[PDB]
Amino acid sequence: QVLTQTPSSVSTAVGSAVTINCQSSQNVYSNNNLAWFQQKPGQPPRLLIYDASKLASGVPSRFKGSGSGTQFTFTISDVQCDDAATFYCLGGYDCSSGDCAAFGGGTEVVVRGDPVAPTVLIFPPAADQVATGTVTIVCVANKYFPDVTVTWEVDGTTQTTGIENSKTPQNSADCTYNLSSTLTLTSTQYNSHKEYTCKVTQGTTSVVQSFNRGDC
Amino acid sequence: QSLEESGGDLVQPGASLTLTCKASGFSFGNNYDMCWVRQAPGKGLEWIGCIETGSSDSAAYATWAKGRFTISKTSSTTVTLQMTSLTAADTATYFCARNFDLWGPGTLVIVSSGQPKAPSVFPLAPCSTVTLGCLVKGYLPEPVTVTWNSGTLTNGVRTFPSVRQSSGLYSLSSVVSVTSSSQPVTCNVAHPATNTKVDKTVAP
């Protein structure tokens, strides 16, 4: 029993319909023991559809599945930001001929909403940092779409090492992201430059925040 | 009508561990399929096995798990999962589910020969509203939870997913957008795997 789910991911706009596919190496039990789940980060999966096409209770009708035996499809109608999540199919099998179940591999769905531009904040190191030997500077990009790019600049120069990026899930109301970027330097290097800048660009347009070591 | 898993922790390789699934608002005297499912960080759902309750009592498992793990009904509101000969491949969050319909929030398991290390918290502050934060760093292993004013502050809170630094240790940041009242705020950083809890008060 192997459930093959495709695609592994897909980007799609608000107002669109979107299709996910599941294909099984053997017929699922009774030709219909097949189900569909949504899972956002840090939550447990949620049942949307069972018996191939029954809506679980409380689940909206714009979720729709169909199929039989070894081939099944899942369609979301009229996509919205709240839908952004990862989806799985679950196969249930004849316990006597092999294993009882197999999860599909998951599809990541990304929803495209209205473009919004980022605001950026920069946070210079707390005082107890530099006495530790290593220093970290934090840059935060808020409430934007689509994805942005980040460059760190130390006294006009560009950083290639010590950078780390991290993104919040998509807002369920307006599809927007949030990012924290961090630049890490040993105490020598930090205390050996003055200007520190974080460049968040979105296309041709950028936002740039900077600070000076002494100034803080 | 809910479920909760407990018993997750950091264990050495080749060790053994029992997770318990607690039922609230109902009991396992009725007819259910109580199953466990695990999900390694950034990966897909994996089925481990089931135990029937009520009027029949079948234990069934995935081929990989069969013989190495056990599942059983230890009372009318507890189902356990017992693991043995643990390795890195078993690191994951573990869910128990009722009929794959009702689910618990999950308990976490790290298998590794690494030793714990509590986090250092530093305040995040700008050089009519303000965004202040707390940088948590150099901790191991996961997870860690941050709250503001002990659960009082909830709106305006953005806690980023942790990232393993090149040092091999983890780090994350949490920010909150706050006006004048409230008012000089406190971040609450709890790190279970070292039994510590650090508070940090920040202000404009």
Binding site: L47, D94, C95, A101 | -
Partner: peptide, 10 residues
């Protein structure tokens, strides 16, 4: 008497 897995209501 377990033939498969139960998914959803009984």
């Amino acid at each position: 008497t377990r033939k498969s897995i139960r998914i959803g209501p009984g």
